[PDB]
From a paper:
H5 and H12 in the 6-helix bundle are discontinuous. dimer indicates clusters of charged residues on both sides of the membrane. transported by PaNhaP, K+ is not. structure thus serves as an excellent model for the membrane part of NHE1.
but unlike K+, Tl+ is a substrate of PaNhaP. Tl+ is able to replace Na+ in PaNhaP. the main-chain carbonyl of Thr129 coordinate the substrate ion. Glu154 and Asn158 is not directly involved in ion coordination. ion via a bound water molecule. molecule next to Tl+ is green. surface and ∼22 Å from the extracellular surface. structure shows the inward-open conformation of PaNhaP. Tl+ may account for the lower transport rate in PaNhaP.
Numbering used by the authors:
A (entry chain B): 1 to 419
B (entry chain A): 1 to 420
Amino acid sequence: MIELSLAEALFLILFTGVISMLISRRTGISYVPIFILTGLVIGPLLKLIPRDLAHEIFDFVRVFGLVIILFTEGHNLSWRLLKKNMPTIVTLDTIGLILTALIAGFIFKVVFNSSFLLGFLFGAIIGATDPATLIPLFRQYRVKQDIETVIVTESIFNDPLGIVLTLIAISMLVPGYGGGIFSTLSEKLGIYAGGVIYFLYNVSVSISLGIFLGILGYKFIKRTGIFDFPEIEAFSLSLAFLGFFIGERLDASGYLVATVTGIVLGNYKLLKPRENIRILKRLQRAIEKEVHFNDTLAALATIFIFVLLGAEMNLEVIWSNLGKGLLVALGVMILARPLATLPLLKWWNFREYLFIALEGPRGVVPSALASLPLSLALKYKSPLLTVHWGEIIMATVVITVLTSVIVETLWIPILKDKL
Amino acid sequence: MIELSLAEALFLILFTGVISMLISRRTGISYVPIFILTGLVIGPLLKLIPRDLAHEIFDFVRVFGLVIILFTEGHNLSWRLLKKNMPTIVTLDTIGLILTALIAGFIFKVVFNSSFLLGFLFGAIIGATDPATLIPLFRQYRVKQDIETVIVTESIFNDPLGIVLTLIAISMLVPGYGGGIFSTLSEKLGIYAGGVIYFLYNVSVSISLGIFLGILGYKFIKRTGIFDFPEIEAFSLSLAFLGFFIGERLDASGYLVATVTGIVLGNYKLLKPRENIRILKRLQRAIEKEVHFNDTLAALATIFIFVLLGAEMNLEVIWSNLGKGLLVALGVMILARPLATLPLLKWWNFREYLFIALEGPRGVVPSALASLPLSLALKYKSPLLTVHWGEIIMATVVITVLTSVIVETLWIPILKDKLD
Ligand SMILES: CCCCCCCCO[C@@H]1O[C@H](CO)[C@@H](O)[C@H](O)[C@H]1O
Ligand SMILES: CCCCCCCCCCC
Ligand SMILES: [Tl+]
Ligand SMILES: [Tl+]
């Protein structure tokens, strides 16, 4: 605890996270458990970074980090690969996501003895997936591309869709956090109906404003000539955060807005420019630079998120509920997940569907949403969501992230040969 | 009291700053008064960004910003051009800087009926130079590459040294700031000898540590194979701040350590000859990626610094002493700089000397250290430095920056066509 409380803590997270990243690449082991372990070392163990600083930093890193993460994830998306295998993807992010959210919710409620709403909070938090761990092994194991594309795309589209479900599941238990459209719509049309209508509204408006601001920004780049350093990176950053803030100002998921914007800018090629060659080549250069910068920021954000999650956990609650946590984990990675991917069996084989379903692990987004109910319960004390359930949900999320990551990372060589 | 949301405030500053940057590039107007006027619009006038909130943000933006900016700036230094023009820039960064701070401080002391310490604080603040607002007009008029090299390098070295001089002046006013060594010497030798010996200590230790960390980092990159995304950027950032914190824990200028580190990293080919071609390729790849990211961050930090400076100022005190601040500013531009640059004509002609001694403006660093004594006054209670004197210092720094940038960027063609 000799270090500076604020600055040197941040720098400690950065430094140790970087070293952890290096040794992760060198070892070949996943970056998730390495980062979590690092946080565990500098956090709970060595007591260098107490939970207070962890929360305070995580309150900013949540917003900035998640926004930039979803933006860069939007960038690394090719719409053609999506269109080639659309139906098997679009439905699972529309239905399968909510389905596994409900099954995880129930299977959480029946073991931790709570409300279906809190269980649904856990499920919504843990909704998004992260297959970035599997990719380094996929490329060297030469697994089929047709599944990699649909899994990665699935993650790209479910990441912001897990935040909105978390945002609404929270808004139910705490009255203050929800406001504007949700309050009135829910007050006039009940919880369920008003919630579904609010969901559709949020998604539709987010996609609309996303495409709008994406194309508008893309045209603004040409109209005023933004190709050179440092205007492109700065303007793109400001664009993403513009989408987020005015997307949230009219009460809608600005995260999904930023994601869709990243999709638009990421696929400028298909925007029908009818423009000259010079402009498009130099614009390709500019977009590449911007992608580099923002992806660096997203890397730093990823590291910070995982390390903070590792340094914000308390081993007391976790060890107190380890068996239950593992039970929930295996409950959502073996039971909830395949039964939520049933419609995928329509266009896919038995073993293929089994693979795709069973495979998906949880990562960045659930890690960044884990401490949210806790941190919110501490500030806005509600009898439905207290500190106890905050610790419970968070611990369960961390447990499931770790478990899913390690287990699903380790069981692919044999499963490849079996199929 | 804080009104607008923090995240929305930060975003507002970023957005308006970017738009202002575009407008500044297209119009040809220097980005300094554009940013300052932008912040001025969103700051005092509209009260979108509360002055207290501006303070709280600035306290972070200066620490992160100055470090990343100086570290990046260190890469833009050529050791060959440094060796070819050593005594000149050495005379500039040492003698010229200190003398400038002293005489400008004397002017401020005379005008505002100040003490010697407050004046020296002002001079130390406006000691640094930022010729980045002159580069376009330099490479458009095809001015001599020599004087451009000299000016730019002088900026590179005198930017952190200006913070040290400010650190000195700050430590002499508030009891808490002066840490470790400086205190000992100060209570043993006195403020003069203590300040000088601590200056030498800070400079030497920061430079040596910067070289050590630069070489160590280079060897680590070369060894472990830190060549590709995203290892190089993250690691270089971690190193850039490692130098800062380590340097600050040794009671030295961490900014100077980061700067020297950037100097070492920028000149990677020089550290080892005979090294394989492929190695130089990969190393240049990594270095270019790093430079891209960190320079982008430095640009954002510059935007934030200038805009925040614009949003922080209060027009009351400024307009109350506009003539005084302008008088001090003209005293710095006309008297201070050339009088401190007089021994430079031992290697250059009178015209070249005059150009050099009339071009150097005040930009980023003095703009980030503008409200530092004011902030400290609001933080700690000292019988020497008060609040309103911090207001005076800040406002005078603002006027100085604006006038220096505007005028010394404006008179470039008239001055050049007469001199060279
Ligand atoms: C003005 C000097 C600051 C550096 C400007 C670099 C402009 C080009 O930026 C380039 O972006 C590329 C995107 O892939 C990176 O791979 C390169 O490393 C980077 O140099
Ligand atoms: C309060 C102590 C509770 C102990 C629970 C430990 C769970 C370990 C499960 C191992 C499968
Ligand atoms: Tl994802
Ligand atoms: Tl400079």
